[PDB]
Enzyme design. Structure first.
Site, PDB file in Angstrom:
ATOM      1  N   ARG B 150      18.881  48.324  27.600  1.00  0.00           N
ATOM      2  CA  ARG B 150      19.373  47.650  26.408  1.00  0.00           C
ATOM      3  C   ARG B 150      18.915  48.360  25.147  1.00  0.00           C
ATOM      4  NH1 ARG B 150      21.224  45.088  29.727  1.00  0.00           N
ATOM      5  NH2 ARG B 150      22.637  43.302  29.549  1.00  0.00           N
ATOM      6  N   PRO B 327      41.185  51.436  45.903  1.00  0.00           N
ATOM      7  CA  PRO B 327      42.443  50.820  46.343  1.00  0.00           C
ATOM      8  C   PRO B 327      43.353  50.522  45.163  1.00  0.00           C
ATOM      9  CG  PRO B 327      40.547  49.763  47.376  1.00  0.00           C
ATOM     10  CD  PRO B 327      40.010  50.639  46.291  1.00  0.00           C
ATOM     11  N   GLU B 356      46.101  44.298  48.357  1.00  0.00           N
ATOM     12  CA  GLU B 356      47.035  45.334  47.931  1.00  0.00           C
ATOM     13  C   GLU B 356      48.441  45.074  48.454  1.00  0.00           C
ATOM     14  OE1 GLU B 356      45.907  46.906  45.547  1.00  0.00           O
ATOM     15  OE2 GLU B 356      43.922  46.140  46.075  1.00  0.00           O
ATOM     16  N   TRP B 458      24.511  35.588  19.080  1.00  0.00           N
ATOM     17  CA  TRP B 458      24.763  35.899  20.481  1.00  0.00           C
ATOM     18  C   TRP B 458      23.742  35.209  21.363  1.00  0.00           C
ATOM     19  CZ3 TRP B 458      27.628  38.118  24.274  1.00  0.00           C
ATOM     20  CH2 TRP B 458      26.977  38.621  25.397  1.00  0.00           C
ATOM     21  N   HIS B 486      33.541  46.524  29.195  1.00  0.00           N
ATOM     22  CA  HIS B 486      34.813  46.102  28.617  1.00  0.00           C
ATOM     23  C   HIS B 486      34.778  46.125  27.098  1.00  0.00           C
ATOM     24  CE1 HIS B 486      35.542  44.780  32.724  1.00  0.00           C
ATOM     25  NE2 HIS B 486      36.811  44.621  32.399  1.00  0.00           N
ATOM     26  N   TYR B 496      40.306  37.231  32.937  1.00  0.00           N
ATOM     27  CA  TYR B 496      39.462  36.820  34.052  1.00  0.00           C
ATOM     28  C   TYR B 496      39.275  35.312  34.114  1.00  0.00           C
ATOM     29  CZ  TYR B 496      38.423  41.771  34.174  1.00  0.00           C
ATOM     30  OH  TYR B 496      38.526  43.139  34.247  1.00  0.00           O
TER      31      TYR B 496
END
Ligand SMILES: *[C@@H]1O[C@H](CO)[C@@H](O[C@@H]2O[C@H](CO)[C@@H](O)[C@H](O)[C@H]2NC(C)=O)[C@H](O)[C@H]1NC(C)=O
Ligand SMILES: *[C@@H]1O[C@H](CO)[C@@H](O[C@@H]2O[C@H](CO)[C@@H](O)[C@H](O)[C@H]2NC(C)=O)[C@H](O)[C@H]1NC(C)=O
Ligand SMILES: *[C@@H]1O[C@H](CO)[C@@H](O[C@@H]2O[C@H](CO)[C@@H](O)[C@H](O)[C@H]2NC(C)=O)[C@H](O)[C@H]1NC(C)=O
Ligand SMILES: *[C@@H]1O[C@H](CO)[C@@H](O[C@@H]2O[C@H](CO)[C@@H](O)[C@H](O)[C@H]2NC(C)=O)[C@H](O)[C@H]1NC(C)=O
Ligand SMILES: *[C@@H]1O[C@H](CO)[C@@H](O[C@@H]2O[C@H](CO)[C@@H](O)[C@H](O)[C@H]2NC(C)=O)[C@H](O)[C@H]1NC(C)=O
Ligand SMILES: *[C@@H]1O[C@H](CO)[C@@H](O[C@@H]2O[C@H](CO)[C@@H](O)[C@H](O)[C@H]2NC(C)=O)[C@H](O)[C@H]1NC(C)=O
Ligand SMILES: *[C@@H]1O[C@H](CO)[C@@H](O[C@@H]2O[C@H](CO)[C@@H](O)[C@H](O)[C@H]2NC(C)=O)[C@H](O)[C@H]1NC(C)=O
Ligand SMILES: *[C@@H]1O[C@H](CO)[C@@H](O[C@@H]2O[C@H](CO)[C@@H](O)[C@H](O)[C@H]2NC(C)=O)[C@H](O)[C@H]1NC(C)=O
EC number: 3.4.17.23
Lengths: 50, 702, 96
Positions: B150, B327, B356, B458, B486, B496
């Protein structure tokens, strides 16, 4: 001296800047701090010297 | 015409777009199948040509006002071709933004930390550090890895993130949006339907409404996990407090699944596992795909064409050639669908093959739709549709009916409890994290959080929404949220959440349509033609109509719903309520792992100085930290006769208030996990209080 | 001369405190005049020629750049600005 102690106890309890709650503006700030959050103002003990 | 010319424009655009895109797909596929250098430039020029074609087509679509359009399909296609993107941004600003994004990605990918007692041994993130966090059971090692990653990542990513947010906000405001968050939320926005509208601002309200219902089950799960973590790290976790951030089996706490080895309900009895039966029968890496195709055929869904089976790369070569075998399902187009993966003999590979296969079936279901409309309804539909197939196929009933798992097996409810808890650790343990991260990002973009308070806000959220407390205080120089993959690569995170809701909605609807005995966790939809017809009724639409209409065609609802998830996890909820009679369910946002050894300081400058008093800022904090370090050095030299080099970065400070009061504690110079006890700090302050006071012109009462 | 009796002994911890005070002074001067937030540390104060008289030479460099040496003019200005704080941090008075 009693009024200065009464100011100091609230200042310490609520971590306000030193020099914000004076003799002329003590009651309004005292009730504003109480209205902000109960159960933390309750433990503060003030003196009613006059 | 106007309609005729618009249709001609669309037709002539599609006529080229098909083949350009098709050749680009061959380039990417040929690169991925075998790593060849000669095809890298072929991919590059093809991609550049395709991007230039898209840019020019966008430029030749401005002369089409949106108020004269009657057909809805051409309206949607024109809107999907109408967004400017980064074009409106200035050339210098565009170059700056691209450079900052590339720098961010490079720092995240190639940043390494190093051991404090062997600086010639340094570890990257995904090898080594990830294994340290996922496997180690040592408190000190995990805390070191957490804090060390961090530190460097936040310090390097902070100013880049500030400039990036400023530039992205400016670009979004230039495009008739409130901010970047509105642009991100605009994916679910649908208008001009008179009965299915969805505003951009309604997404926040819907997400909050869903989380308010999901809160209690997560609270019970959190209490159970905290109770079970005591036996692993005694004298480190409070029975009424939160969980330390580094003990959660993951670098960021996104998933809780790595705790399953510590929190299993009945470890003496294992769950279902017949991966050895497949080994005994000598099953090559070809029967699983045929079984998946048969299972998909059983429901009546269209089958696989011979073109797919012709191109088969799933068998890993294993030679000196090294290629990525992640995959993936390829949708090159014009009846060309493929799956690229490395196929082994294991359960997880079996389920991934089903995943898949479902991806490919969904992708080719809407082939008849126009090219610009060849996609899912929104960002969350594709993964949910691909995943519910595997979820239904993973039940032991399907395994028994397929030939394996001989019928002479009496299932016990302990295995069901173990399976439900393992599923919960992955599904329910990640919803608060996703919700909190997206909330923080939205309010940072919208300007609600001042740039001065970012870190503060935060961590406050993590103490009140997730129930996780940091082990060391973090000042404003850090960028902990930017440590995620992300955030630093500019990706959206609400998919998500919506996918996790939609998958269970779909599973419940399919089970109810198939008339299952009771859809708790053991529901299967095999050999049900009506279920396949209902699924196909929504699969083939693509983007031709709003996703609300597609949802109504299956579940009969216009919004996200949480009741199916609670219905799925009800047995575990009952067990957890039974098991938490003595534990204190909930947490308190006051306990901190470092609070026991801290010392509070209160400073009254005005009383001591009155007039001429100086102003207190961060330079005075630096001087105070240096004075405390000097005091600790002196005490350790003059009593314990040790030469320890305390610095001003070993004095950790927290809870700064305008009263000028704060807490502080002291750690060993290079060891972060080692905290000097409060008694030694008291003795050192007693010894050097006179110098501490006179350095600031205060006297023992101020 | 300043203390006579009750004087403390001078060792490397006092040198650390002196370097920290000089860094604080340079930080304050750069903030209050040039309006720049520069993070001077105690490792940017380079010290040489230590003698039992307690006399030494020092200079200051940029925080992460050894090649960049702050000229003597602004070091003099910063010392002039914060001399009172430097003095009372050590119990010495402008002659000691
Ligand atoms: C301030 O603290 C007092 C402590 O009780 C509370 O005041 C209540 O409201 C009015 C004030 O005029 C009184 O009649 C009540 O007797 C008070 N006590 C109650 C309802 O239990 C309250 O916490 C705060 N009041 C204000 C005006 O801020
Ligand atoms: C990359 O791997 C493949 C297979 O190992 C090889 O090239 C392919 O060889 C087959 C013949 O069986 C051809 O049908 C393909 O057209 C070839 N792929 C191409 C030309 O892209 C070879 O080992 C490598 N291909 C190279 C270097 O081009
Ligand atoms: C799309 O635009 C056309 C007008 O060109 C309309 O749809 C047509 O409707 C007739 C029915 O009589 C069909 O025979 C045509 O095949 C349709 N043309 C299409 C779909 O391109 C209508 O304005 C719009 N149709 C939609 C949105 O479904
Ligand atoms: C994308 O950016 C261009 C800017 O070049 C926008 O074109 C403008 O459109 C408005 C509205 O009709 C006109 O008033 C301007 O004169 C146009 N500017 C030009 C042509 O340079 C275009 O509308 C944008 N696309 C959107 C907002 O969807
Ligand atoms: C869809 O594809 C499957 C293949 O998995 C078909 O099943 C076989 O298809 C071949 C044709 O090549 C037939 O000869 C077989 O009789 C089929 N059954 C078996 C057990 O092999 C299936 O028929 C196809 N489904 C359709 C056309 O509805
Ligand atoms: C697993 O199954 C056994 C028996 O099927 C359960 O034992 C009974 O559970 C019911 C309801 O919980 C109780 O009323 C009984 O007192 C239990 N004992 C009996 C019938 O002898 C057991 O609780 C189940 N355990 C788990 C984790 O599900
Ligand atoms: C850094 O952190 C702790 C100090 O708190 C050290 O760990 C101690 O020593 C061994 C580890 O080898 C274990 O008994 C415990 O982890 C700690 N024992 C205690 C506090 O009595 C750790 O070795 C230190 N690492 C260094 C100095 O390199
Ligand atoms: C460290 O300080 C020196 C200056 O003392 C910096 O050197 C400058 O580098 C740029 C190169 O673009 C030259 O244009 C300047 O003329 C140089 N300054 C001079 C010669 O006085 C050096 O870049 C600094 N290193 C850093 C900030 O990493």
């Amino acid at each position: 001296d009693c009024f200065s102690t009464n100011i100091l106890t609230l200042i310490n309890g609520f971590d306000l800047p030193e020099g914000n709650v004076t003799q002329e503006n003590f009651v309004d700030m005292q009730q504003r701090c109480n209205a902000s959050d109960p159960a933390a103002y309750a433990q503060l003990v003030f003196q009613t010297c006059d | 015409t106007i309609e005729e010319q618009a249709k001609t424009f669309l037709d002539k655009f599609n006529h080229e777009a098909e083949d350009l895109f098709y050749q680009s797909s061959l380039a990417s596929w040929n690169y991925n199948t075998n790593i060849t250098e000669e095809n890298v430039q072929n991919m590059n020029n093809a991609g550049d040509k395709w991007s230039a074609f898209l840019k020019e087509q966008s430029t030749l679509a401005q002369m089409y006002p949106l108020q004269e359009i009657q057909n809805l399909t051409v309206k949607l296609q024109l809107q999907a071709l109408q967004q400017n993107g980064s074009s409106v941004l200035s050339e210098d600003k565009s170059k700056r933004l691209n450079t900052i994004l590339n720098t961010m990605s490079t720092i995240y990918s190639t940043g390494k930390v190093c051991n404090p007692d062997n600086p010639q041994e340094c570890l990257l993130l995904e090898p080594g550090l990830n294994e340290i966090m996922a496997n180690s059971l040592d408190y000190n090692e995990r805390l070191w890895a957490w804090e060390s990653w961090r530190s460097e990542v936040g310090k390097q990513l902070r100013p880049l993130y500030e400039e990036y947010v400023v530039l992205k906000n400016e670009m979004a405001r230039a495009n008739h949006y409130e901010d970047y968050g509105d642009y991100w939320r605009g994916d679910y926005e649908v208008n001009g339907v008179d009965g299915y509208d969805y505003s951009r601002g309604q997404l926040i309200e819907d997400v909050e409404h869903t989380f308010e219902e999901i809160k209690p089950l997560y609270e019970h799960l959190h209490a159970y996990v905290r109770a079970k973590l005591m036996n692993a790290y005694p004298s480190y976790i409070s029975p009424i407090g939160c969980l330390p951030a580094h003990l959660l089996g993951d670098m960021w706490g996104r998933f809780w699944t790595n705790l399953y080895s510590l929190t299993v309900p009945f470890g003496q009895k294992p769950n279902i596992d017949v991966t050895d039966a497949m080994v005994d029968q000598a099953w090559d890496a070809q029967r699983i795909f045929k079984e998946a195709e048969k299972f998909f055929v059983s429901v009546g869904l269209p089958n696989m064409t011979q073109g797919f089976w012709e191109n088969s790369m799933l068998t890993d070569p294993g030679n000196v050639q090294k290629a990525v075998c992640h995959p993936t399902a390829w949708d090159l187009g014009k009846g060309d669908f493929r799956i690229l993966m490395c196929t082994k003999v294991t359960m997880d590979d079996f389920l991934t093959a089903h995943h898949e296969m479902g991806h490919i079936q969904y992708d080719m279901a809407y082939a008849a739709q126009p090219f610009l409309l060849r996609n899912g309804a929104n960002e969350g539909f594709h993964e949910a549709v691909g995943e519910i197939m595997s979820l239904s196929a993973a039940t032991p009933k399907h395994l028994k009916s397929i030939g394996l798992l001989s019928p002479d097996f009496q299932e016990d409810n302990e295995t069901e409890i173990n399976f439900l808890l393992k599923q919960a650790l992955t599904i329910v343990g990640t919803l608060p994290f996703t919700y909190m991260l997206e909330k923080w990002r939205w309010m940072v973009f919208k300007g609600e959080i001042p740039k001065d308070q970012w870190m503060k806000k935060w961590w406050e959220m993590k103490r009140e929404i997730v129930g996780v407390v940091e082990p060391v205080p973090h000042d404003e120089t850090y960028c902990d949220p930017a440590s995620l993959f992300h955030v630093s690569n500019d990706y959206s995170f609400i998919r998500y959440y919506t996918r996790t809701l939609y998958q269970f909605q779909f599973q419940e609807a399919l089970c109810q349509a198939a008339k299952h005995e009771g859809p708790l966790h053991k529901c299967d939809i095999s050999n049900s033609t009506e279920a396949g017809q209902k699924l196909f009724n929504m699969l083939r639409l693509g983007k031709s109509e709003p996703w609300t209409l597609a949802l109504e065609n299956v579940v009969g609802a216009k919004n996200m719903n949480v009741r199916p998830l609670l219905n799925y996890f009800e047995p575990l909820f009952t067990w957890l309520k039974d098991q938490n009679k003595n534990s204190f369910v909930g947490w308190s946002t006051d306990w901190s792992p470092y609070a026991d050894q801290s010392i509070k300081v209160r400073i009254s400058l005005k009383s001591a100085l009155g007039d001429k008093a100086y102003e207190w800022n961060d330079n005075e904090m630096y001087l105070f930290r240096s004075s405390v370090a000097y005091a600790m050095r002196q005490y350790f030299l003059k009593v314990k006769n040790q030469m320890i080099l305390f610095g001003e970065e070993d004095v950790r400070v927290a809870n700064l208030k305008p009263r000028i009061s704060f807490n502080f504690f002291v750690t060993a110079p290079k060891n972060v996990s080692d905290i000097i006890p409060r008694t030694e700090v008291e003795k050192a302050i007693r010894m050097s209080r006179s110098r501490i006071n006179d350095a600031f012109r205060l006297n023992d009462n101020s």
